[PDB]
């Protein structure tokens, strides 16, 4: 199971931003202009428009994937090995053979 991580967004108040390139899994990015975001303290920019925002998203492995995970394997020619007990007369013998 993946974990989606949404970073702390980037905000440029009276300018622009551009999407970059990353190596992160399923990395998505988008620029949104005409933005005017608020927090508990109030407004966070000094231009009422032209205040682009950058959104990111990628995925990681969940904290508990160290136990809950699957391994994909390809299998090839299967070879049989047997353990045999052989008793001839008074002696018994144990051996493994291919």
């Amino acid at each position: 199971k993946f974990h989606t991580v949404i970073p702390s967004p980037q905000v440029k108040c009276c300018g622009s931003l551009e999407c970059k390139a990353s190596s992160k899994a399923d990395y998505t990015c988008r620029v949104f202009g005409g933005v005017y975001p608020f927090m508990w303290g109030g407004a966070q920019c000094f231009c009422d428009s032209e205040n682009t925002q950058l959104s990111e998203a990628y995925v990681e492995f969940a904290p508990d994937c160290t136990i809950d995970h699957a391994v994909a394997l390809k299998v090839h020619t299967a070879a049989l090995k047997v353990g045999l007990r052989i008793v001839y007369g008074n002696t018994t013998a144990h051996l493994d053979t291919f």
């Binding site: 993946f2 998505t28 988008r30 975001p37 959104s55 998203a57």
Partner: protein
């Protein structure tokens, strides 16, 4: 997206992960800071719901399936030709039997 193997790595601590989970980033419609997005379900979870029955219950010839390493044990199938060379100290002549 939405199927088994939608996130792939060589190891769990591997730094290079490839994924395709159909992430869509939406324009924020509220005034507070927010990153709205929508995504596909986890293919691993979907598979865990649709895994079926394991190989420990469906293997033919009464095989017992074990991991580490992957193997089938105590299967009953076919015939095994064996050639044995008996030591000559295990034979007694007819003059003694």
């Amino acid at each position: 997206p939405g199927a088994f193997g939608d996130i792939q790595a060589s190891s769990l601590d591997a730094t290079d992960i490839v994924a395709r989970t159909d992430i869509r980033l939406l324009k924020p419609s509220v005034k507070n800071i927010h990153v709205p997005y929508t995504q596909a379900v986890s293919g691993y979870e979907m598979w865990k719901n649709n895994s079926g029955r394991p190989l420990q219950e469906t293997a033919p010839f009464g095989c017992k399936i074990e991991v580490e390493p992957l193997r089938a044990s105590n299967c009953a199938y076919g015939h095994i030709p064996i050639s044995i060379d008996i030591p000559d100290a295990a034979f007694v002549r007819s003059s003694e039997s």
